[PDB]
Write a protein that binds this DNA or RNA. Structure first.
Ligand SMILES: [K+]
Ligand SMILES: [K+]
Ligand SMILES: [Mg+2]
Ligand SMILES: [Mg+2]
Length: 133
RNA sequence: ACAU
DNA sequence: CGATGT
């Protein structure tokens, strides 16, 4: 109902889908960019959204921060909850890099704990997520 | 349909 | 318009 301003917001940007994928995380309150992932040559929107959330979890854990994460991605939120990114993207040589990162993100989820709430950014009510590209 |  | 997803 109300924005939790003491939070980290993430978003994916892409050139094509599948296409070049990047993501970033921002302080929801201030818009300060807290992390940005170097563009990945081929990936899907949902893989990027998933990697962004997981990176946020790792970022906040490293800093002993209990802030929640906002994502606007129904899909990625579910994939993180499940610890399983159910992407349809073909695994081939061109998609190897994104799939390695997705596999490693799943692996991290499966070997670490966190209490970070992962919250749906309610775009219909609040406008674009603050990490938007 | 909903979320991108 | 087409693509990624539940
Ligand atoms: K975006
Ligand atoms: K669809
Ligand atoms: Mg998004
Ligand atoms: Mg966006």
């Amino acid at each position: 109902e109300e924005i939790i301003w003491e939070s980290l917001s993430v978003d994916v940007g892409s050139q094509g889908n599948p296409g070049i994928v990047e993501y970033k995380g921002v302080d929801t309150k201030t818009g300060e960019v807290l992390f940005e992932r170097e563009p990945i040559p081929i990936g899907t929107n949902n893989m990027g959204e998933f990697l962004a959330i997981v990176h946020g979890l790792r970022y906040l854990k490293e800093r002993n921060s209990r802030k929640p994460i906002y994502s606007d991605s129904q899909t990625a939120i579910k994939w993180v909850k499940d610890k399983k990114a159910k992407s349809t993207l073909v695994r081939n040589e061109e998609t190897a890099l994104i799939w390695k990162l997705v596999d490693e993100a799943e692996e991290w989820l499966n070997t670490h704990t966190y209490e970070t709430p992962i919250l749906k950014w309610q775009t219909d009510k609040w406008g674009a997520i603050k990490a938007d590209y």
